[PDB]
Design a protein around this motif. Structure first.
Motif, PDB file in Angstrom:
ATOM      1  N   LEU C 264       0.822  -1.173   0.000  1.00  0.00           N
ATOM      2  CA  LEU C 264       0.000   0.000   0.000  1.00  0.00           C
ATOM      3  C   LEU C 264       0.855   1.221   0.000  1.00  0.00           C
ATOM      4  O   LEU C 264       0.593   2.156  -0.746  1.00  0.00           O
ATOM      5  N   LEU C 265       1.976   1.199   0.752  1.00  0.00           N
ATOM      6  CA  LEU C 265       2.893   2.308   0.804  1.00  0.00           C
ATOM      7  C   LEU C 265       3.663   2.377  -0.482  1.00  0.00           C
ATOM      8  O   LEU C 265       4.240   3.411  -0.794  1.00  0.00           O
ATOM      9  N   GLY C 266       3.594   1.315  -1.308  1.00  0.00           N
ATOM     10  CA  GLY C 266       4.049   1.329  -2.668  1.00  0.00           C
ATOM     11  C   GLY C 266       5.385   0.698  -2.767  1.00  0.00           C
ATOM     12  O   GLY C 266       5.926   0.568  -3.861  1.00  0.00           O
ATOM     13  N   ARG C 267       5.939   0.237  -1.629  1.00  0.00           N
ATOM     14  CA  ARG C 267       7.267  -0.312  -1.557  1.00  0.00           C
ATOM     15  C   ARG C 267       7.277  -1.627  -2.285  1.00  0.00           C
ATOM     16  O   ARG C 267       6.278  -2.339  -2.244  1.00  0.00           O
ATOM     17  N   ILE C 268       8.401  -1.970  -2.967  1.00  0.00           N
ATOM     18  CA  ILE C 268       8.528  -3.163  -3.780  1.00  0.00           C
ATOM     19  C   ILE C 268       8.484  -4.350  -2.838  1.00  0.00           C
ATOM     20  O   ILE C 268       9.372  -4.441  -1.994  1.00  0.00           O
ATOM     21  N   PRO C 269       7.485  -5.231  -2.848  1.00  0.00           N
ATOM     22  CA  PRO C 269       7.445  -6.387  -1.976  1.00  0.00           C
ATOM     23  C   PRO C 269       8.582  -7.316  -2.260  1.00  0.00           C
ATOM     24  O   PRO C 269       8.798  -7.665  -3.415  1.00  0.00           O
ATOM     25  N   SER C 270       9.277  -7.766  -1.200  1.00  0.00           N
ATOM     26  CA  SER C 270      10.429  -8.618  -1.295  1.00  0.00           C
ATOM     27  C   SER C 270       9.899 -10.014  -1.456  1.00  0.00           C
ATOM     28  O   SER C 270       8.703 -10.229  -1.294  1.00  0.00           O
ATOM     29  N   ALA C 271      10.803 -10.975  -1.776  1.00  0.00           N
ATOM     30  CA  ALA C 271      10.570 -12.379  -2.048  1.00  0.00           C
ATOM     31  C   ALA C 271       9.418 -12.979  -1.307  1.00  0.00           C
ATOM     32  O   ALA C 271       9.288 -12.809  -0.097  1.00  0.00           O
ATOM     33  N   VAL C 272       8.529 -13.673  -2.045  1.00  0.00           N
ATOM     34  CA  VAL C 272       7.424 -14.433  -1.513  1.00  0.00           C
ATOM     35  C   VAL C 272       6.384 -13.430  -1.047  1.00  0.00           C
ATOM     36  O   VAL C 272       5.475 -13.717  -0.275  1.00  0.00           O
ATOM     37  N   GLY C 273       6.510 -12.183  -1.544  1.00  0.00           N
ATOM     38  CA  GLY C 273       5.573 -11.113  -1.378  1.00  0.00           C
ATOM     39  C   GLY C 273       5.678 -10.463  -0.041  1.00  0.00           C
ATOM     40  O   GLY C 273       4.884  -9.584   0.281  1.00  0.00           O
ATOM     41  N   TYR C 274       6.699 -10.798   0.763  1.00  0.00           N
ATOM     42  CA  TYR C 274       6.737 -10.313   2.112  1.00  0.00           C
ATOM     43  C   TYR C 274       7.459  -9.012   2.074  1.00  0.00           C
ATOM     44  O   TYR C 274       8.309  -8.806   1.221  1.00  0.00           O
ATOM     45  N   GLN C 275       7.134  -8.133   3.043  1.00  0.00           N
ATOM     46  CA  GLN C 275       7.586  -6.779   3.251  1.00  0.00           C
ATOM     47  C   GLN C 275       9.039  -6.577   2.895  1.00  0.00           C
ATOM     48  O   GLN C 275       9.834  -7.448   3.231  1.00  0.00           O
ATOM     49  N   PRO C 276       9.504  -5.473   2.340  1.00  0.00           N
ATOM     50  CA  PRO C 276      10.924  -5.234   2.186  1.00  0.00           C
ATOM     51  C   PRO C 276      11.472  -4.869   3.537  1.00  0.00           C
ATOM     52  O   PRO C 276      12.680  -4.929   3.731  1.00  0.00           O
ATOM     53  N   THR C 277      10.580  -4.539   4.485  1.00  0.00           N
ATOM     54  CA  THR C 277      10.883  -4.104   5.813  1.00  0.00           C
ATOM     55  C   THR C 277      10.524  -5.246   6.727  1.00  0.00           C
ATOM     56  O   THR C 277      10.103  -5.024   7.857  1.00  0.00           O
ATOM     57  N   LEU C 278      10.577  -6.508   6.230  1.00  0.00           N
ATOM     58  CA  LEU C 278      10.052  -7.643   6.954  1.00  0.00           C
ATOM     59  C   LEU C 278      10.820  -7.860   8.201  1.00  0.00           C
ATOM     60  O   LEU C 278      10.234  -7.980   9.271  1.00  0.00           O
ATOM     61  N   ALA C 279      12.158  -7.826   8.110  1.00  0.00           N
ATOM     62  CA  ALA C 279      12.968  -8.118   9.251  1.00  0.00           C
ATOM     63  C   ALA C 279      12.833  -7.069  10.307  1.00  0.00           C
ATOM     64  O   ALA C 279      12.665  -7.389  11.477  1.00  0.00           O
ATOM     65  N   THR C 280      12.898  -5.782   9.905  1.00  0.00           N
ATOM     66  CA  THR C 280      12.933  -4.692  10.843  1.00  0.00           C
ATOM     67  C   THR C 280      11.687  -4.571  11.659  1.00  0.00           C
ATOM     68  O   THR C 280      11.751  -4.235  12.835  1.00  0.00           O
ATOM     69  N   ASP C 281      10.518  -4.812  11.039  1.00  0.00           N
ATOM     70  CA  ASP C 281       9.262  -4.749  11.735  1.00  0.00           C
ATOM     71  C   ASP C 281       9.132  -5.802  12.785  1.00  0.00           C
ATOM     72  O   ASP C 281       8.602  -5.541  13.859  1.00  0.00           O
ATOM     73  N   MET C 282       9.603  -7.033  12.508  1.00  0.00           N
ATOM     74  CA  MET C 282       9.653  -8.051  13.522  1.00  0.00           C
ATOM     75  C   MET C 282      10.639  -7.699  14.576  1.00  0.00           C
ATOM     76  O   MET C 282      10.420  -7.979  15.744  1.00  0.00           O
ATOM     77  N   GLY C 283      11.746  -7.045  14.181  1.00  0.00           N
ATOM     78  CA  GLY C 283      12.807  -6.672  15.071  1.00  0.00           C
ATOM     79  C   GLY C 283      12.380  -5.690  16.100  1.00  0.00           C
ATOM     80  O   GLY C 283      12.763  -5.786  17.261  1.00  0.00           O
ATOM     81  N   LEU C 284      11.607  -4.673  15.687  1.00  0.00           N
ATOM     82  CA  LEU C 284      11.083  -3.696  16.593  1.00  0.00           C
ATOM     83  C   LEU C 284      10.108  -4.312  17.532  1.00  0.00           C
ATOM     84  O   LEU C 284      10.098  -3.993  18.718  1.00  0.00           O
ATOM     85  N   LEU C 285       9.225  -5.180  17.011  1.00  0.00           N
ATOM     86  CA  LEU C 285       8.237  -5.815  17.828  1.00  0.00           C
ATOM     87  C   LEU C 285       8.879  -6.718  18.831  1.00  0.00           C
ATOM     88  O   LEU C 285       8.466  -6.763  19.981  1.00  0.00           O
ATOM     89  N   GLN C 286       9.897  -7.477  18.415  1.00  0.00           N
ATOM     90  CA  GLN C 286      10.422  -8.523  19.234  1.00  0.00           C
ATOM     91  C   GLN C 286      11.694  -8.162  19.916  1.00  0.00           C
ATOM     92  O   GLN C 286      12.380  -9.050  20.407  1.00  0.00           O
ATOM     93  N   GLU C 287      12.038  -6.863  20.030  1.00  0.00           N
ATOM     94  CA  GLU C 287      13.126  -6.490  20.904  1.00  0.00           C
ATOM     95  C   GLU C 287      12.609  -5.606  21.982  1.00  0.00           C
ATOM     96  O   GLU C 287      13.350  -5.234  22.885  1.00  0.00           O
ATOM     97  N   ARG C 288      11.294  -5.329  21.994  1.00  0.00           N
ATOM     98  CA  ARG C 288      10.713  -4.655  23.120  1.00  0.00           C
ATOM     99  C   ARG C 288      10.279  -5.710  24.096  1.00  0.00           C
ATOM    100  O   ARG C 288       9.887  -5.387  25.209  1.00  0.00           O
TER     101      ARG C 288
END
Lengths: 50, 499, 468, 62, 56
Positions: C264-288
């Motif tokens: 929706l933000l228009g960012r190019i979806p990375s492999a298997v259609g998952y977020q290009p920001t896939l790692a970082t979003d989990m990272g923020l969630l799972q380091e709090r």
């Protein structure tokens, strides 16, 4: 020793809130104006040094 | 107290410097900002925003410069004033970084005061030429016999450790650092390794366990830890190995021998992938950007055994690749494999089937290993790689191969496998490894029933030291076995084996 | 006052053009007053020229392009407190349990950076679990993320309910059940069940706080729901120094929601259609989620694998964060075992010898070896016959079939549900139970006199009852 | 200048006072007392044992 | 010292090997070995008794 280190950290964050108290003090005072005049002349001196 | 000293430091900051130029931020988001001005900017400069965040200009375009934010978007704001640092991205390097955890920027996340560093050196620096290199000869003793015979590793040597996720992947490297604790607790600078552990894409919690582990083994005092945790911004992660290698190069360019373990370059790939996609550069093969090969190769080739003329420099490299359920065919693994010389593929099946460390010997190679290998460990290691690729073949067709010759090999092979196993975080001395390999190779380990092999190892070693540690001291210095030493060892081995 | 007129509404991506020198900041919260009350838009870009690009947290059913917007001034601030315990709260931070203003005192931003390197605890610790099976074969680690696998209803939901009860007795901490992509019908049932099992006592005090993120929510609001829950937890840990347990429903649906928001933000979806920001979003969630000096959150997450393809990037990214895995199975539950935990698939990464104690480790390893050998042994024992069970083999079978039953522990939430009085078997007594069965001391007590009973002490009673 | 104002004013005008040692006791683990000489050991006590063991054995059993 | 204890332990094994030389004499040897081996690791474990009021 552990509590001593903790107390030093606690002192530092308490004094952080003392900075907040000072921020409110500067922005209240017409030192907000008068020290801006000081900054103005300091920049005049600075820019003259070019 | 300390507060008064800090306040003295606060009094000690107050600039009056003129800003050469600023910019004002335009459209911002996607961890890149597009700034107007910055016309006198150098390429790959560091700019500092007025959010205090710093970024590296990547795309210098007619009329605009596009910073890449080394730091969170939240901090940066639209139409904010970007100030030129004026310097190409450099990081502090020096002798004082030993025993200091730092983040990628070089901030002391250990918090053992502001870092003591001689200089700063550019994040990207060209690898030394052909003429600067010299062939490896000195060993690195990992304390894992397999990773010292089956894979011997040497000083300044590029090598690869590849395998499946969190099989205590980290532990394999840690053991190397631990083993070389006694060499580094030596006074010989040549035999001192200054080891850098790069933690990229790892939980900040996990890193904290690692730090505590290292400080438990009091190994921190000879080692630096660089950290680029999962939380830390993707551009920071991207520049994280490069920065770590600069610190390593300062040691290398002190001539000093060192090691740098990059855990995990597979996470650098994901980071660079993220960055590339966010730079809207077209996705490459397997959706990993097309310059991913270039990225790894530029990083890896900055590790070298510099020639004696150019310093005798060394900086050993172990980069840790996280295979997705194995299968070495996979773009990121293959790209790495091609750069590295030697691989230490680890097998999940063996790990599950209780071989710790789980060093697959089918897929572990060392493509320059034998030069590093000590003569003692060449003599005692009588083509053990061949022998266990006869064991590998034998057990391939065992389930047929009922031949007594095959069975003899199987009995040796299975028993030899028992010797390979080592309780992780307890590495064996090199001197001690020499007899063990003698025993097994010379087949005195058939004389030990498989169940009691573990007992045999400790007891054999205790026996040898008590009987004559004179032999062990001799091979410790000579690093070769004379016919007499070899015979003495054969005789002694026969003596314990019998008993 | 920072106000701006809506200048686009392409999908749920609403671009607002703001008056000069009255510029939002990234991650700020804007509120557009609507006949739907308010619409909360979160600024996720500045497109320059005093325009932004925002995501929505409520479905945008039409705005007039030019509608005045008011800027809250920062990332959504949701109420937190002991009041919010036992309150169902929607994403924007307003009651959907309709018990009126839940505002304890303070509200806090939904985003909040992970605790510092210094804050992190330097050594692993154990979170107690009344479930004996858990405490042997994969003991929970306070601070950590433990990823659930298995059924639903009689599977997962009851398991989750059990944990809440246990935590209340065990620590007396808090919990927050955050349900992402939750079928609202199922959510209703859960709220009623939670009331019934009294983890929410409307009149009484409540342990678990509920944050429900329904399937009819727009993907942006699905994405931020998790972070909101996390904030609630952090108030407990940081500012009340307590242990918390934060449930998340599908983190697959965390991924799914996130993937949409990227696209929706228009960012190019990375492999298997998952977020290009896939790692970082989990990272923020799972380091709090960590053990701070103050307290520790611990999080049980539910992972619904995409076609069981572990190799898919989304499970892999999750597994990287995970510390332990609890693998409930319904086949196992069908072997009459409550808890439903599949013991051979129960694994923790803090099943480490040092961490759990050497003695505990040795006991655990033996029980694992026993079960492992037993399972394999039963494969050909069933076919060949029980006559093939040697003295050595039947020693293992006798102990094993006794252990298998011994696992069956009726527990307090399902005291009603199974009809069998609950048991909360603490860790010390867990070690004791297995020590004795390993030493065959209580191997002389019938198999079903270990069926559906708790600890070592308990099966003394059951032995008496078997005879009686 | 403003730095000086903030610094000066803050340092001088705001001075924290630490808590008492008694309050500290709760937050620390306070001195554990001596472990006492416990009780010494007397093994094979009484000549009951001695006569019994000498008399009882008269053959070495396996 | 410790060598006396272990020599008599294994000696009694080879005496019982022949016409019986121990029943519980060897059990006495085993017991003294247990605690003797405990005290040596205790004695090497030994905390320094002086409180470091110098450094800490």
């Amino acid at each position: 020793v552990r509590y001593e280190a903790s107390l030093r950290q606690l002192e530092q964050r308490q004094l952080a809130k003392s900075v907040i108290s000072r921020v409110q003090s500067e922005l209240g005072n017409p030192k907000f104006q008068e020290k801006v005049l000081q900054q103005s002349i300091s920049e005049i001196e600075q820019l003259l040094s070019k | 107290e300390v507060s008064s000293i800090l306040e003295e430091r606060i009094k000690g900051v107050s600039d009056e410097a003129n800003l050469n130029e600023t910019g004002r931020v335009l459209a911002v988001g996607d961890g890149i900002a597009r700034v107007f001005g910055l016309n006198n900017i150098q390429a790959e400069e560091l700019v500092e925003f007025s959010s205090g965040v710093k970024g590296m200009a990547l795309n210098l375009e007619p009329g605009q410069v596009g910073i890449v934010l080394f730091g969170s978007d939240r901090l940066v704001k639209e139409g904010e004033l970007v100030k030129r640092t004026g310097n190409i991205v450099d990081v502090p390097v020096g002798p004082g970084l030993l025993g200091r955890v730092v983040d990628a920027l070089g901030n002391p996340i250990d918090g053992k005061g502001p870092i003591d560093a001689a200089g700063r050196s550019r994040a990207q620096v060209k690898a030394p030429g052909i003429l600067p290199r010299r062939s490896v000869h000195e060993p690195v003793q990992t304390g894992l016999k397999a990773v010292d015979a089956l894979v011997p590793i040497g000083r300044g040597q590029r090598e690869l450790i590849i395998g499946d996720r969190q099989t205590g992947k980290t532990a394999v490297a840690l053991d190397t650092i631990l083993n070389q604790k006694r060499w580094n607790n030596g006074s010989d600078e040549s035999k001192k390794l200054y080891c850098v552990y790069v933690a990229v894409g790892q939980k900040r919690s996990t890193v904290a366990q690692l730090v505590q582990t290292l400080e438990q083994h009091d190994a921190m005092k000879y080692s630096i830890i660089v950290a680029a945790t999962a939380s830390e911004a993707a551009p920071l992660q991207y520049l994280a190995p490069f920065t770590a290698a600069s610190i390593g190069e300062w040691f290398r360019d002190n001539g000093k021998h060192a090691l740098i373990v990059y855990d995990d370059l597979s996470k650098q790939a994901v980071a660079y992938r993220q960055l590339s996609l966010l730079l809207r550069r077209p996705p490459g093969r397997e959706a990993y950007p097309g310059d991913v090969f270039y990225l790894h190769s530029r990083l890896l080739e900055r590790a070298a055994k510099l020639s004696e003329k150019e310093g005798s420099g060394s900086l050993t490299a172990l980069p840790v690749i996280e295979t997705q359920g194995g299968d070495v065919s996979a773009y990121i693994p293959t790209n790495v494999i091609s750069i590295t010389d030697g691989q230490i593929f680890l097998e999940a099946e063996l790990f599950y089937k209780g071989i710790r460390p789980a060093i697959n010997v089918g897929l572990s190679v060392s493509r320059v290993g034998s030069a590093a290998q000590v003569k003692a460990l060449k003599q005692v290691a009588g083509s053990l790689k061949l022998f266990l690729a006869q064991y590998r073949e034998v057990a391939a067709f065992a389930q047929s191969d009922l031949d007594a010759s095959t069975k003899q090999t199987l009995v040796r092979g299975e028993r030899l496998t028992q010797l390979l196993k080592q309780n992780q975080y307890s590495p064996l001395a090199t001197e001690e490894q020499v007899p063990l390999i003698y025993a097994g190779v010379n087949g005195h380990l058939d004389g030990i029933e498989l169940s009691r092999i573990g007992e045999f190892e400790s007891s054999f070693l205790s026996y040898l030291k008590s009987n004559h540690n004179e032999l062990l001291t001799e091979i410790r210095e000579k690093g070769e076995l004379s016919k007499e030493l070899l015979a003495s060892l054969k005789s002694a081995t026969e003596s314990f084996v019998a008993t | 006052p920072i106000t701006g007129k809506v200048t686009a509404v392409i999908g749920a991506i609403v671009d607002v053009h703001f008056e000069q020198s009255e510029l939002p900041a990234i991650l700020n919260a804007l509120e557009i007053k609507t006949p739907q009350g308010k619409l909360v838009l979160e600024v996720a870009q500045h497109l320059g020229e005093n325009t932004v690009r925002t995501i929505a947290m409520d479905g945008t059913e039409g705005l007039v392009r030019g509608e005045k917007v008011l800027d809250t001034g920062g990332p959504i601030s949701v109420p937190v407190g002991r009041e919010t315990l036992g309150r169902i709260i929607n994403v924007i931070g307003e009651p959907i349990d309709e018990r009126g203003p839940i505002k304890s005192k303070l509200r806090k931003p939904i985003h909040a950076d992970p605790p510092s390197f210094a804050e992190q605890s330097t050594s692993a610790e154990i979170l107690e679990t009344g479930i004996k099976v858990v405490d042997l074969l994969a003991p929970y680690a306070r601070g950590g993320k433990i990823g659930l696998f298995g059924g639903a209803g009689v599977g997962k939901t009851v398991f989750i309910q059990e944990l809440i009860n246990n935590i209340a007795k065990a620590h007396g901490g808090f919990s927050v059940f955050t349900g992402v992509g939750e079928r609202t019908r199922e959510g209703n049932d859960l709220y009623r069940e939670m009331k019934e099992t009294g983890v929410i006592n409307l009149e009484g005090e409540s342990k678990v706080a509920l944050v429900f993120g329904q399937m009819n929510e727009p993907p942006g609001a699905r994405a931020r729901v998790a972070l909101t829950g996390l904030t609630i937890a952090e108030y407990f840990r940081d500012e009340e120094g307590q242990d918390v347990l934060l449930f998340i429903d599908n983190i697959f649906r965390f991924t799914q929601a996130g993937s949409e928001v990227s696209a929706l933000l228009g960012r190019i979806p990375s492999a298997v259609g998952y977020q290009p920001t896939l790692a970082t979003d989990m990272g923020l969630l799972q380091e709090r989620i960590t053990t701070t000096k103050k307290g520790s959150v611990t999080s049980v997450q539910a992972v619904y694998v995409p076609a069981d393809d572990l190799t898919d990037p989304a499970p892999a990214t999750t597994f990287a964060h995970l510390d332990a895995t609890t693998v409930l199975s319904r086949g196992i539950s069908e072997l009459g075992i409550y808890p439903a935990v599949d013991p051979l698939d129960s694994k923790s990464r803090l099943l480490d010898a040092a961490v759990v104690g050497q003695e505990h480790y040795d006991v655990a390893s033996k029980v694992q070896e026993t079960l492992q050998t037993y399972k394999s042994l039963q494969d050909i024992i069933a076919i060949l016959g029980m006559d093939e069970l040697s003295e050595q083999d039947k020693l293992t079978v006798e102990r094993a079939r006794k252990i298998q039953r011994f696992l069956s522990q009726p527990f307090a939430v399902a005291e009603v549900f199974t009809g069998i009085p609950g048991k909360l078997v603490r860790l010390k007594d867990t070690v004791a139970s297995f020590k004795a069965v390993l030493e065959g001391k209580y191997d002389n007590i019938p198999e079903h006199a270990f069926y559906m009973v708790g600890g070592i002490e308990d099966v003394v009673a059951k032995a008496e009852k078997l005879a009686a | 200048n403003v730095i000086q104002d903030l610094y000066l004013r803050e340092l001088k005008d705001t001075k924290l006072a630490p808590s008492t040692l008694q309050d500290a006791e709760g937050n620390v683990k306070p001195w554990n007392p001596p472990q006492k000489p416990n009780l010494p050991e007397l093994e094979l006590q009484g000549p009951e044992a001695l006569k019994a063991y000498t008399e009882q054995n008269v053959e070495t059993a396996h | 010292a410790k060598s006396a204890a272990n020599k008599l332990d294994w000696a009694k094994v080879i005496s019982s090997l022949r016409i019986t030389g121990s029943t519980a004499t060897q059990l006495s040897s085993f017991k003294k070995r247990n605690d003797e081996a405990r005290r040596q690791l205790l004695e090497l474990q030994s905390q320094p008794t002086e409180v470091d009021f110098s450094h800490y």
